[PDB]
Amino acid sequence: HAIGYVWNTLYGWVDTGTGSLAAANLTARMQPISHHLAHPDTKRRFHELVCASGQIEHLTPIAAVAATDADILRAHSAAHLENMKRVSNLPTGGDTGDGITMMGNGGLEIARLSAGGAVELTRRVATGELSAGYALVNPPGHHAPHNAAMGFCIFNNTSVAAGYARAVLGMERVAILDWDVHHGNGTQDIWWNDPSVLTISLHQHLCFPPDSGYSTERGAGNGHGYNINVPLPPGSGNAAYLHAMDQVVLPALRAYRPQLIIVGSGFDASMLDPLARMMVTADGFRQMARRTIDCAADICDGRIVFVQEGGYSPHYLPFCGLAVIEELTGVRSLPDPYHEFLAGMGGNTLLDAERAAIEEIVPLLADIR
Amino acid sequence: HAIGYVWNTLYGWVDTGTGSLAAANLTARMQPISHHLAHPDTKRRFHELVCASGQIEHLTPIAAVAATDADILRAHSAAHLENMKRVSNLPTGGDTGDGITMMGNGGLEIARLSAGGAVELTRRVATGELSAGYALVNPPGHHAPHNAAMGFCIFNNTSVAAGYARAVLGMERVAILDWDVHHGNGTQDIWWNDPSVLTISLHQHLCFPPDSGYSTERGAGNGHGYNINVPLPPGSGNAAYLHAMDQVVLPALRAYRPQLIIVGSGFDASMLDPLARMMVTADGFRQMARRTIDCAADICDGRIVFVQEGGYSPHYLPFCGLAVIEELTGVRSLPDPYHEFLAGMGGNTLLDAERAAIEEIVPLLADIR
Amino acid sequence: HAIGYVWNTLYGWVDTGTGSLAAANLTARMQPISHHLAHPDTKRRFHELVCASGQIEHLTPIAAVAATDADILRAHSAAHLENMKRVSNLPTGGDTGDGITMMGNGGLEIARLSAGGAVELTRRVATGELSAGYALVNPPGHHAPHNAAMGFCIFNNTSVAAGYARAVLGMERVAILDWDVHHGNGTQDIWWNDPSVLTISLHQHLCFPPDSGYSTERGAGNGHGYNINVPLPPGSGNAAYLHAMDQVVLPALRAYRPQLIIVGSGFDASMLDPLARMMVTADGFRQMARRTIDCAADICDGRIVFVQEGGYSPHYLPFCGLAVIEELTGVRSLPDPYHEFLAGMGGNTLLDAERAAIEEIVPLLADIR
Amino acid sequence: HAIGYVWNTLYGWVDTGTGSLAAANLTARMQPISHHLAHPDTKRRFHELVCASGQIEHLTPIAAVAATDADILRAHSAAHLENMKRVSNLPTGGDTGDGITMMGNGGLEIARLSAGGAVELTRRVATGELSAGYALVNPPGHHAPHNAAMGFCIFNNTSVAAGYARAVLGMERVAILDWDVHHGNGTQDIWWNDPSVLTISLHQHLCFPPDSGYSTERGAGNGHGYNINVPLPPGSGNAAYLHAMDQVVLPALRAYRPQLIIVGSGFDASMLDPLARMMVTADGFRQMARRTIDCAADICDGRIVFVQEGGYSPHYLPFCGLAVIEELTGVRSLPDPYHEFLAGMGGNTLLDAERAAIEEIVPLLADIR
Numbered sequence A, B, C, D: 001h002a003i004g005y006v007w008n009t010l011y012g013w014v015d016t017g018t019g020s021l022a023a024a025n026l027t028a029r030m031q032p033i034s035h036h037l038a039h040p041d042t043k044r045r046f047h048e049l050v051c052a053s054g055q056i057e058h059l060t061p062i063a064a065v066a067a068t069d070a071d072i073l074r075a076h077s078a079a080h081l082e083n084m085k086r087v088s089n090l091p092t093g094g095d096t097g098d099g100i101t102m103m104g105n106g107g108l109e110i111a112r113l114s115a116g117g118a119v120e121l122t123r124r125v126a127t128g129e130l131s132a133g134y135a136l137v138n139p140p141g142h143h144a145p146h147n148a149a150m151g152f153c154i155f156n157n158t159s160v161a162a163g164y165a166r167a168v169l170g171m172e173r174v175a176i177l178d179w180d181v182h183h184g185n186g187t188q189d190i191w192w193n194d195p196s197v198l199t200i201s202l203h204q205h206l207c208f209p210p211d212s213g214y215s216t217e218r219g220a221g222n223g224h225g226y227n228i229n230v231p232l233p234p235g236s237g238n239a240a241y242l243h244a245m246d247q248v249v250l251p252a253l254r255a256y257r258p259q260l261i262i263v264g265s266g267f268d269a270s271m272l273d274p275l276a277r278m279m280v281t282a283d284g285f286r287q288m289a290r291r292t293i294d295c296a297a298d299i300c301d302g303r304i305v306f307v308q309e310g311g312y313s314p315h316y317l318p319f320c321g322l323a324v325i326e327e328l329t330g331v332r333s334l335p336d337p338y339h340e341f342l343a344g345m346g347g348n349t350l351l352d353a354e355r356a357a358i359e360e361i362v363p364l365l366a367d368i369r
C-alpha cells in the first residue's frame, strides 16, 4: 500500500487568458474577466486542500517528467504536436483551434508535464512500486483527439499514458474509465479502431461536444464493441451515477479484464459546477472511487491510476477530489462541509428516465470479449 | 413608452466576504477566495453591458431612494430591522443569521437602496410616468421572510414594493411573479394570509430552501389559494419554463387581474449557473419576458416592474439580463454570443416529468378569484 | 459654475492581459496574474467613488464622443493611426510596439473614446457651456509621441484635445501641464517645434522613459523655450511638488497666457504608488489642483480641463482623484481616510536636493514670451 | 553544503479580509477589494517561483513545526498569547488591535506555523544538519512587540527563533538583522534590555511605525548599545543599501561575534513596492545576501537563517526573493526579467543625504562589546 500523488507548480500557471470561455471580445461586448471558467486556481485549490488536510502525509509524492515527442506520438499526430509548438512560441500564446482552448506563452512545457505526470504515475503503479495513485494534472486531456486540441485539452493525457502502457510496458489490455461530465470524444477517437484500450465515458448527454457520445458510437473494425458511451440526462445525481457504475461500468471492466485501469477523474458532474447540470456530491464521488478501486483489486491486482480531467467549482471541487484521495489512502479525516447543504437538493433517487438511459447500455456488455 | 432603469454604485459594493458560500473556515479547510458565489461583480457586469451595448440610450435612468423604516416595516418586523442595523454597525459587518448571508460594514445603507430602488421604480411606473422598468438592485430579496434575513437577502425588495403599492398607492391587487430558480419562501411567508398580493414562484424543486416550495403551500385564511408554487425538476430548460408560463403563470395573472405585476427577475435558472441545475438560455428568458410584458399590456395597462433577484454566472448572466431589457425597450441590437454553444445542450423538448410537474398546478387556478 | 465630468463604461473594459507589466512568459518564469499593474479597475474605483461620495450630484455628466480620424491626425501621424486600426483587429489584440502596451481586441474603439472624452470636455469648457471639468479617461495618453504608441498610451489624449482647441476653436495659445509622475515624452515630442502649445512636465527624474525629461529638452525652432521639464528626485513629497508649482509651473503659465489649460492629471506620484517613488498625498494633489484652478481663473477665464493620465494604487488613487474633483466643485464632503497614516511618513519638508532641482528651471521662465 | 527551505500551504491561506489596509468601510467610502495590500499571494508567488525555477532541486525542504506556547513565551507575554487564542476563535476572525492586523478564523494555527517554521530552520542550521536556509513564512513578525500584535504581525517570528537559540540551543550571542523597509520596532522592544540578542534594523525613516526607528533608540541597561537603527531617506537604492551594509551592518556583526545570524528578510525596499519609497532591485538584494552569507562564513561557521518579513509587489517580489535563494544555493540559473527596466530608474549612486544618514551610525559601533 503506497499511493502516488502528482502535482507540479506549472499546472497552476496555465494561462487561460482574459475571456470567460472564448476570448474577451469588445464587438460582442464580452467583457474581460480575471478568471476564465477553466482557470487553474480550481485544481490548485484541490492540491492545497490535499496538503492542508494532512492527506499528503499518507501519499508518496511523484515528480512529473515531461512527456517526450515519442510519448505524445503514441496518442497524437506529428502535425498536432508541431501546431502546439507553434502556438506555445507566440509571445502571448493563443487559441489552439476551437476558439475556447487558450494556451499561454510557453504552455507546451505545461502540456508535456501534464501528460508526463500521467505517464510517470502509470509507470510507477505498473511496476508495483505504488499500489495506486492520483495525478492531479492540468491542462486536461479527454477532448483532444488524435489530430487536434479541443475543449481546454492540448494532449490526451490518459491516452498518452495508455499508449505508454501498451508500447513500453507491453500490456495487452488497458481500460480508460472517464467520469468527467463531458463526453470523452478525444479518447474515443484515438482508440476507435483498437480493442486493446477499452474506452468508457459516463457523461451528460450532449453537454460537450454537441454532437457526440451517443450509445451507438461503439468503435470500428476489431475495435467494434470496445468503446462504451453512457449518456445520462441533465439533473442526474448520486443514484444515477452509482446505478451506472453497478449496471454498466464495473461489469464492463470485469468482462474486459484490463491489466491497468486509468480513471479520467473529472469533478464537473458536481452539484455546483457551472459547466454541466448534474447533481453528484463528494459522497457520490467517494462511492464511485471506492467501487472502482475495489474492482481493480478483484481484476488487475489493484493497478488503478486516477488522472484529473475537468471540474469548474473552485468552492466545491476540492472536497470532491479530497473524497477520492481519501478512498485511495483509507484515511478519512475531514468532512465535506457542504454535505448537509447539498444533500437536501436531491439526485438521491433513481428516476425512471435515468434508469432507462443506463439500461440502454447493458446489452452491449456481451460484446466485450 | 418610457422604460425606467435603476442602478446605484453601491449595489456593486456589497461585501460578500472572503468565503465561498459560508465564511472561510480554517478548521474545516475552506480556503478563502476573492469572489464569493454571490459577489456583486455578476450584477455589475449586467449593468455595464446595459451601458456598453447602447441599451441605456433607450432607458430612462431612475435614481434609487433609500427605503425608510416605514417602507421596510410594510414587509418586515421591527426586530428584523433593528438586527440589521446592529450587524451593519459592526466594524467588518458580519453574517445576518443563516450562516450564508454576509452584510458588510455599513451594508444597511445598500439594503435600503436596494429596496428603495424597487419602491421608486414601482411608484414611477404606477403613476404612468413610465410604462415599465427594470430595477437592477443588489442585495436580492425573495428569501427574506417577515422576521429575518436569509439566503443572501436582507430585505424582501419586491414585498417592500408591493407593500408600498398597497398602502401608499391604494392598489387592491398586486402580483409578485418570481422566476428566480430558488423558491421565493420569504415572499410566500410575508403574504401567506393575504389575498391582496398573489405570490407565484417558479423554481427548481428543493434547490433552496431545502424544505419548501411544494405545491401544497397555498396560503392560509383569506389568503388560501393566493400563493402558487411551481416546483420543476432539475434539468428543466426553455421548453419546461415556457410551458409553465403558458399553462400556469399567465393564466394565474389573467385570473387575478392584478393592478401591478412585480417580476422577481433572477437568472440563476440559466444553463451556466453554479447554484442550480436548470437549462434556460438568454432566448428562454427573452420569451418569458415578452410573454409577461404582453400579459400586463392585456390586464393592468402595461404596469409591470422587474426587480433583480439572483443569478451567479458573471460570464452569462449579463446576456440573460440584456435579453429582458431588450424586450422592454423593443430594441434588439446585440446577439447572445453563447447562443449556438448552449443551444446544442438541450432543454428544448418538454419531458414527461417536466410536463407532469407543471400540470399539478393547473387545478389550483380555479381558486384564484 | 458648471463642472463637467466624463466617464464611459468602456474605459473600465481595457484588456491589459495576463502579465504584470510585460506579458506573462513561462520561460522567464513570469507567472500570469489577474491584475496587470495598469488594470482598469484602479480608475474605475475612482469613478465609483465620485458617484458614491455624492460628488456626482455637483457635476454635469458629459458623454464621451469618439475621436474621429481628423481629431487623431491633429496629434499623430497617419501611419500610427493606420497601425492602430490594424492591431485592433487581432482576435485577442496584442502589444502595439514597446512590449508593455497591450491593446485588447476592438480596442481602438476605447482609444477613440478616451481621446474623444478629452476633446468633448475641452469643447464644452472652451465654448463656455461649462466652467471646468474632469475627463476620467482610459487608456492614458502622455507617452504616445507623434508616430507611436508607448507606455500604455495609444493616442495622446491631451494633445488631441490641444490640437482641437487650436484648429477648431481657434485658440492661439494652449498649455498642457502634466503632473503624472512619469515624463510626458509623447506630448513633448508632438509639440517640440511649436510655441502655440506650451508643454510642461513635472516628473520623477528618469522614472519612465529612462533617457528623457532632462531640463535641457527645451523644444526647437520656433518652439525653443516652449517645453519645460521639471525632473524631481525620488522621494519628493508635497513640499517639493508645491514648491515646483509656486516657483516654476504657475509662473510659466502666467508668463505664457494660455487661453486654455489642460492638466494631464496622473496620481502615480502618490505615496502608495508601485510605479514611482514619490510621496504626494491626497491633500498634496488637492493643493496642486486648487492652485492651478485659481491660476486659470486669473489668466484664461477659468478655462481648465483635467484629463486622467496614470496612477496605479487601486487603494489610494480614488481619494487623490476625489480631492481634485472636490476642488473643482467646491464641495468638500469626505475625508481622506489615509490622511493621518500617510502624513506621518514625511515629504512635507522641502529638502535641499529637491529645492535645487526646482531652481534649475527658474532661469528658463524668461524665455517664455 | 545543505540549504534548508520552509514553506507551508497555510502561509498562503492567511485571510487578510476585504479591505485595502484597514477594513472596508462604507461610511468612509473605502470600497471592498479582492486583494488587501498584505494578501498572501505575494509570498506564494515567491514560493512557486522557487519551485518552477528549479531552485527547489538544490534545497532541502523542511516542514514547519507549530510553535508551542513555551516557544512563544520566549518572545511574548502570556497575556498576548492568551489574547491571540481568544481572537482566533471569532467566526470570521478580526483585527487584533492596531486596525490594520487581521487574523482570520482559526488563524492562530497559521501564526504558530509561521513562528515554528523559523524555529525549525534555526534548529537544523544551528545543530549543523544544514549550513543555512530560508524560511518563507507568513504572517510576518518584526512589528509585534512583547505584549501585542502590530503591523500585520501576530508573533515575532525571528525573536521566537532567537529565544529558542538562546534558551534551548545554549547560544550566548544571537544577531537579528532586519532589512524589511519598515522599522523592526517589535524586535527592538523584545530585546531592548538584553545584550545577548543584537538587534539591527535598516529601514526607511518613519515609514512605519510613524514615531520610531531613530538612531537614538539604543536599548537600555545591560542592553544599551545592543540595538542599532539605520534610518535611511526615501528614494534610497542599491548604493545606499550596500554602503549601509559595508559601513554599519557587517562591521556591527563582526564586532558582536554572534553564534547565529537571523535575517529578517523583507523585500518591501524594492523599486516597485507600494508600501515604501525605496529603490532596491533584485541585484541589490542579491549583493546584500552575498555579503551577509560571506560574513557569517567568517564569524559563525556560516550559521545564517533567513526568515521572510514584508514585501508587497506580487509582480517583483518573487525575483527579489529568488536572488537571495540563488545566493544561498550558489546556482544562478534565471535572470531578473525586470533588470534593465529598473536599472535605468537610478538609486545606483550614493547621494550625500544617504551617505550622511549612514555615517550617523558609525560612532555607535564602538559600544558593541
Ligand SMILES: Sc1ccccc1C1=NCCCN1
Pocket (backbone or CB within 6 Å): A050, A051, A052, A056, A057, A061, D007, D008, D009
Ligand atoms: S503538499 C505540500 C504543500 C506545501 C508545502 C509542503 C507540502 C508537502 N509536500 C510533500 C511532503 C509533505 N508536504
Ligand SMILES: Sc1ccccc1C1=NCCCN1
Pocket (backbone or CB within 6 Å): A250, A251, A253, A254, A294, A295, A296, A298, A299
Ligand atoms: S469490478 C469486478 C471485477 C471482477 C470481479 C468482481 C468485480 C466486482 N464487481 C461488482 C461487485 C464487487 N466486485
Ligand SMILES: Sc1ccccc1C1=NCCCN1
Pocket (backbone or CB within 6 Å): B050, B051, B052, B056, B057, B061, C007, C008, C009
Ligand atoms: S450606463 C452609463 C455608464 C457609464 C457612463 C455613463 C452611462 C450612462 N448613464 C445614463 C446616460 C447614458 N449613459
Ligand SMILES: Sc1ccccc1C1=NCCCN1
Pocket (backbone or CB within 6 Å): B250, B251, B253, B254, B294, B295, B296, B298, B299
Ligand atoms: S396574461 C393575459 C391576461 C388577460 C388576457 C390575455 C392574457 C394573455 N394570455 C395568454 C395569451 C396572450 N395574452
Ligand SMILES: Sc1ccccc1C1=NCCCN1
Pocket (backbone or CB within 6 Å): B007, B008, B009, C050, C051, C056, C057, C061
Ligand atoms: S455616477 C452614477 C453611478 C451609478 C448610477 C448613477 C450614477 C449617476 N450618474 C449621473 C447622475 C447621478 N448619478
Ligand SMILES: Sc1ccccc1C1=NCCCN1
Pocket (backbone or CB within 6 Å): C250, C251, C253, C254, C291, C294, C295, C296, C298, C299
Ligand atoms: S497663475 C499664478 C501664477 C503665479 C503666482 C500666482 C498666480 C495666481 N494665482 C491665483 C491668484 C493670482 N495669481
Ligand SMILES: Sc1ccccc1C1=NCCCN1
Pocket (backbone or CB within 6 Å): A007, A008, A009, D050, D051, D056, D057, D061
Ligand atoms: S516546490 C514544489 C512545488 C510543487 C510540487 C513539488 C515541489 C517540490 N517539492 C520538494 C521536492 C521537489 N519539488
Ligand SMILES: Sc1ccccc1C1=NCCCN1
Pocket (backbone or CB within 6 Å): D250, D251, D253, D254, D291, D294, D295, D296, D298, D299
Ligand atoms: S563580516 C565582515 C564585516 C565587515 C567587513 C568584512 C566582513 C567579511 N566578509 C567576508 C570576508 C571577511 N569578512
Ligand SMILES: [K+]
Pocket (backbone or CB within 6 Å): A191, A192, A193, A194, A195, A196, A197, A198, A199, A219, A223, A226, A227
Ligand atoms: K477502443
Ligand SMILES: [K+]
Pocket (backbone or CB within 6 Å): A178, A179, A180, A181, A182, A183, A184, A200, A201, A202, A203
Ligand atoms: K466522460
Ligand SMILES: [K+]
Pocket (backbone or CB within 6 Å): B191, B192, B193, B194, B195, B196, B197, B198, B199, B219, B223, B226, B227
Ligand atoms: K398571498
Ligand SMILES: [K+]
Pocket (backbone or CB within 6 Å): B178, B179, B180, B181, B182, B183, B184, B200, B201, B202, B203
Ligand atoms: K422562484
Ligand SMILES: [K+]
Pocket (backbone or CB within 6 Å): C191, C192, C193, C194, C195, C196, C197, C198, C199, C219, C223, C226, C227
Ligand atoms: K511646445
Ligand SMILES: [K+]
Pocket (backbone or CB within 6 Å): C178, C179, C180, C181, C182, C183, C184, C200, C201, C202, C203
Ligand atoms: K509628467
Ligand SMILES: [K+]
Pocket (backbone or CB within 6 Å): D191, D192, D193, D194, D195, D196, D197, D198, D199, D219, D223, D226, D227
Ligand atoms: K538588544
Ligand SMILES: [K+]
Pocket (backbone or CB within 6 Å): D178, D179, D180, D181, D182, D183, D184, D200, D201, D202, D203
Ligand atoms: K527593518
